[PDB]
Swiss-Prot record, chains A, B:
Catalytic activity: (S)-malate + NADP(+) = pyruvate + CO2 + NADPH; oxaloacetate + H(+) = pyruvate + CO2
Origin organism lineage: Bacteria, Pseudomonadati, Pseudomonadota, Gammaproteobacteria, Enterobacterales
Protein name: NADP-dependent malic enzyme
Organism: Escherichia coli (strain K12)
Manner of cofactor binding, per the entry note: Divalent metal cations. Prefers magnesium or manganese.
A GO molecular-function descriptor: NAD binding
InterPro entries listed in its UniProt record: Aminoacid_DH-like_N_sf, Malate_Decarboxylase, Malic_enzyme_CS, Malic_N_dom, Malic_N_dom_sf, Malic_NAD-bd, Malic_NAD-bd_bact_type, ME_PTA
SMART domains: malic (SM01274), Malic_M (SM00919)
Ligand binding (NADP(+)): 195-198, 288, 320
Modification N6-acetyllysine occurs at: 56
Gene: maeB
Pfam families in the record: malic (PF00390), Malic_M (PF03949), PTA_PTB (PF01515)
Length: 759, 759
């Protein structure tokens, strides 16, 4: 293990504060009332409820999201027995992983006890604190006895992940492989190396899944484990003892075998006995920190070999992080009393089915141009796939539903999946009304920049959600080749339409219409033809204008203002308005907030500010929020008389003249706008209540600087912008640094805008 | 208990997320390297260290800041035995209090066990997880046995706070009271009502403190507990069994007594037997939720009565929150193996001494115009006093030092107290170089606004820190009366000087000099006299100019620009400069950051921007930081050609011409300035490294809006501003909403600036 890596690990664990976890409150503790409610005499009130009903304990405490990771330091991942105090950082890291990947609060516990019975007594005593138990690093064979006793005795789910999770992943992998090579589960022959508990659980699951016991072979360091080899051998080991046939060595039984499993040590297998078994071997190496064999050797000696390792640098890694947080999430969200094998089967099926679907953006970006399509080189999902929780947790919850172990049944699964998604993507809670409205009637959207990888990913995700009917512009060859490269599943002509800009049958009409529009703006006919050949944005705008589409989303490459100029020239302002603006959404501690204007006007006057305010209010109303506007300046309610403050005052009077029912006030400082108490101290009778959610700035300088600084400082770094208002058709212009999720959000928003007859 | 209060408590405990705690990471977990370091194979590296040395476990894990709150639900605060699962919210609230008041991470644990021996076994088994144990809600007499066994058996400190903390507070209160009434500890006679463990610990401490056992009387519900009353009575109860004298009732022993203690129930004491004991009774009611008597009754029947209750609405509340977090902080920071009575004595002495000192701003604001000076009405500090940690924890640490139970001795106490203060005030870490430099040579500072409460509090805190020699301006009568009202301790003429603006012997020279300065600016002699009578800022500026002071801090009432105009007129620009600016400090996730210009120039040009940049760089250098400047705009490295961007480009070239060694670049977006990767993606060869810590805006609009929004959104809401640069003398102008701490910080900064010869 590298000395520099060791130094990096020590410095990471040390600075700037020792440890890796921290306990924080989730409530305000500022005033005296917070103290009164969070402690005596307030804290007594919920307590009585728990006395009347234990189930209500799942309703006022963290018990419904608390998991214990208990260890004794006897079976650390690669160090054997070193003491629990030595093993504490491992459990801290496990808890960090829990919180990161499933939003589950954990307590790590080291119990200095070696007697299994006293261990059981302690764990059973600690029951009311937690809602679930996960064991870790307990050596065999004590682990089986402890787990069985606790599962029988305790009333909450218990795992030993090293005994179960690896079994889940291996079962899913081998089932998928048998799907690949088209071999029936009945006639496959099983060969097992090592006596690690993962192997035993694997045979248990496979037998419960359909594998036949007469085709299995279990081999320890003593060779073939046949009946009568020794009388005082373990009963668990005896359960897989076969009728003796004279074979003693692993070489005798490996020939003609279908699947090889190993969790004992490196170099046990060799390329000759790799030649020994049947067609399409199933190499499965789980030994750490080195595998049984080198996958290059197995692949060079046999091409169709399938190899799975426990190391990240090799394809098809079996990492336990794929399972445990999600099974615990599913179990806890229904209050299952215990986790049976039904849940494990459901998890295996979920992993297998997820292995078939299309690749996500994160993993595709992370793992480069590797041939990551379904098949021998890609058989199980990567650890960082975000769809894992959404595909696993509802399945485990339904398995709990069927077996009757649930105690708090869920009504319908749709809101559950929605909540999980809001955990995953951090903007679903904000965008849910938009998605719900858009899904009722999809429209046609043009993405002129149809060769970018981000646009292709967004198109795939839009088709999957059934949220729009995309139209792409570009050369079909490049688009198809990149679709193959990224391993997507959308098919041209079935899920979306491709418009070949270099050669289209409607070129004549398009450039004729463009010239008819722009002849008085200094555009000759040759310029019109050249533009309709070379500029995708013009093609998209013309397509939208003629009614062959319904919305356009552009601007993910190049400058903002060229796209905006083209759009404004083609479409023009909507009736009753003489200006356009851009507005960015943001998530501050005080809630969602919109900022305008950030992109269009460099120095708006009072009239433009009034029109921008009205359009912003309408757009916010679309989100199902009650608009609350604030005009910002360095002047604080007339404390200065620079021209900007006067412009704000005139804009405010204009807005109050036009829309009398809108909640608006100003001009004020930012803190007064965002904080109720500060505003009430200086202006007790203001017409603005609560915290404002629309902020109007005097110039694009202030808007852009504030937006960027808040975007970075509000530690999320996510937005919904720039929404463009004032143009006569539902079009938006993005920025080159826009991510996939923002593109999807704007496509949904444009669809929603286009659903109604454009105003 | 009010139904509306019950509903409020339930809704507080329920929404928006169940529970009150949450476990969060303290390290980044974004990249693959974070995963590699926080888990396999990186996590193995520190583990081996723990195997080689257990003490190093205090160095890479949260064990050094982790406390367990263990309960069985048998002795809840006012509900007796209700079950541990019913009592869980109480421990959650206790842990929240721990984190809020001492920055200590806790695990709350409910053990469903009623056998004391099994309880002891479980707790002793859980030792390696934690660094300290605190018991809670365990009924007598099992609590004594469990605590004794665990203390003997376990190697980390253990408390039962209800048994010890109340004893600490009561001991401090009664010792202070005996100080008040001037009664010797030898001859005072003790009367005890109830058998609550707090009482027994109180007698133990008092006997260990100097109270004589022959003057004590212990009375249970059976009356006088004398020797031979019953043979099979408790040994702990037997330890205070007195030689029989024939007295049987509490009435017989209360007459002639000095101190009455009660923790049994309400209405036990009556006003006649209040008349029974000696002069100046010591009523001490700890029963909940109602006291033994109504304090109004005791005070009306006898004026000099001293009454202490356990309820917030009455004076001198005995709340356990005063002790336990701070004793645990002190014990943990030295690694004490156990907490003996030496630490408890040190804590009692610390509380007693703190009761004498001056009142803090927070408690004085919270508790109104009550006569909160030292005496019968104020005998123990309020729960929210921030000095509690600083006064307690070092004393407990030193007590650990003397008794040899410490395992990680501290070198010197000064850095310890500094670290505690940085925890308390959140800006000491930033301002420490300034305070250290200023404390070496204090100067003379004028605060013209010498009648505000905030200014008086700041003066008190400045005198205490020995950081300046303040001078106040105002009417002496009002100043003295308010000093009495707030209960401060600074004495006029000894700690500070008062300048009577209405009648001063130097009026003639002052107004003559003001006229000599301002005669050509339209100020007649009568106007000069009127100004020197009515305007404190002018008096302060003239005093500074003549050399009778060294710095001035003004502007906590009224508009900014009037004060700034007066200051600029009197002092003028420093040589080589033709402009002035203001700069605000702020604490973002990327570090400390300065923003300019926020208050002076409405629309600076290139030259003013260059001068402001240079002055800001020098001021930042004062803080011992290496300056890094960024010029912000909506244009991103020339993407636009509006006049503002051109002004930035000219300013940048000017700055590079003047100071060639300064690190500066621009103009850029905010995120590019703050984030390294974004800047490196667009401009790989920029001259700015890391994250900038000075931001220069094109106009006061953007600066003010960004500053306010970031101030609120960066969840601290604390600043150090506005620092004023460009004037020839060390003066600063604050804002009316400035708090005490900001005033202290600016006084220190002005002193530091004035220490060197002004440039």
């Amino acid at each position: 293990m590298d000395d520099q890596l060791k130094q990096s690990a020590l410095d990471f664990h040390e600075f700037p504060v020792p440890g890796k976890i921290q306990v924080s409150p989730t409530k305000p503790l500022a005033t005296q009332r917070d103290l009164a409610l969070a402690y005596s005499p307030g804290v007594a009130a919920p307590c009585l409820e728990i006395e009347k009903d234990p189930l209500k304990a799942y309703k006022y405490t963290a018990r419904g999201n608390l998991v214990a990771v208990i260890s004794n330091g006897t079976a650390v991942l690669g160090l054997g027995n070193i003491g629990a105090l030595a093993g504490k950082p491992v459990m801290e890291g496990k808890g960090v992983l829990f919180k990161k990947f499933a939003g589950i609060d954990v307590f790590d516990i080291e119990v200095d006890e070696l007697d299994p019975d006293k261990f059981i007594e302690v764990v059973a005593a600690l029951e009311p604190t937690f809602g679930g138990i996960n064991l870790e690093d307990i050596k065999a064979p004590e682990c089986f006895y402890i787990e069985q006793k606790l599962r029988e005795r305790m009333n909450i789910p218990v795992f030993h992940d090293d005994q179960h999770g690896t079994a889940i992943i291996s079962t899913a992998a081998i089932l998928n492989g048998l799907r690949v090579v088209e071999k029936n589960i009945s006639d496959v022959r099983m060969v097992v190396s090592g006596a690690g508990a993962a192997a035993i659980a694997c045979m248990n699951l496979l037998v419960a899944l359909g594998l036949q016991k007469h085709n299995i072979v279990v081999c320890d360091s003593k060779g073939v484990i046949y009946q009568g080899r020794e009388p005082n051998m373990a009963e668990t080991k005896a359960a897989y003892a076969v009728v003796d046939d004279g074979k003693r060595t692993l070489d005798d039984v490996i020939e003609g075998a279908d699947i090889f499993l190993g969790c004992s040590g490196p170099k046990v297998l060799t390329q000759e006995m790799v030649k020994k078994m049947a067609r399409a071997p199933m190499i499965l190496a789980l030994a750490n920190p080195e595998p049984e064999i080198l996958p290059p050797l197995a692949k060079e000696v046999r091409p169709d070999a399938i190899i799975c390792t426990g190391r990240s640098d090799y394809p098809n890694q079996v990492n336990n992080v794929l399972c445990f947080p999600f099974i615990f999430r599913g179990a806890l969200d229904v209050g299952a009393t215990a986790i049976n094998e039904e849940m494990k089967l459901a998890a295996v099926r979920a992993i297998a089915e997820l292995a078939h679907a299309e690749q996500s953006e994160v993993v595709a970006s992370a793992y480069g141009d590797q041939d990551l399509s379904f098949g021998p080189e890609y058989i199980i999902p990567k650890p960082f796939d975000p769809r894992l929780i959404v595909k696993i947790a509802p399945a485990v919850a339904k398995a709990a539903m069927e077996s009757g172990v649930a105690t708090r049944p869920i009504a319908d699964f749709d809101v559950y999946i929605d909540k999980l998604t809001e955990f995953v993507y951090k903007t679903n809670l904000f965008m849910k009304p938009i998605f719900s409205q858009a899904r009722k009637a999809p429209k046609r959207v043009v993405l002129p920049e149809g060769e970018e990888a981000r646009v292709l990913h967004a198109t795939q995700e839009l088709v999957t959600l059934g949220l729009a009917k995309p139209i792409l512009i570009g050369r079909p060859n490049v688009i198809e080749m990149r679709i193959q490269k990224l391993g997507l599943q959308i098919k041209a002509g079935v899920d979306f339409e491709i418009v070949n800009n270099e050669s289209d049958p409607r070129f004549k009409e398009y450039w004729t219409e463009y010239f008819q529009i722009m002849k008085r703006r200094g555009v000759t006919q040759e310029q019109a033809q050249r533009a309709l050949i070379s500029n995708p944005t013009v093609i998209g705008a013309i397509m939208v204008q003629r009614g062959e589409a319904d919305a356009m989303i552009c601007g993910t490459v190049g400058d903002y203002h060229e796209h905006f100029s083209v759009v404004k020239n083609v479409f023009g302002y909507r009736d009753g308005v003489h200006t356009a603006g851009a507005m960015n959404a943001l998530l501050l501690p005080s809630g969602n907030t919109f900022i305008a204007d950030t992109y269009v006007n460099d120095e708006p006057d009072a009239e433009e500010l009034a029109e921008i305010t009205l359009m912003a209010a309408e757009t916010v109303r679309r989100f199902g929020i009650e608009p609350r506007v604030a005009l910002l300046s360095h002047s604080n309610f007339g404390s200065s008389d620079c021209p900007s403050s006067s412009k704000m005052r005139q804009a405010l009077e204009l807005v109050r003249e036009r829309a009398p029912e809108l909640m608006i006030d100003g001009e004020m400082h930012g803190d007064a706008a965002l904080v109720e108490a500060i505003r009430n101290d200086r202006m007790p009778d203001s017409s603005l209540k609560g915290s404002a959610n629309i902020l109007v700035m005097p110039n694009m300088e202030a808007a852009r600087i504030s937006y960027n600084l808040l975007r970075v400082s509000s530690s999320e770094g996510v937005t919904v912008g720039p929404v463009l208002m004032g143009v006569a058709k539902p079009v938006h212009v993005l920025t080159p640094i826009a991510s996939v999720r923002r593109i999807v959000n704007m496509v949904a928003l444009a669809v929603v805008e286009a659903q109604t007859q454009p105003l």
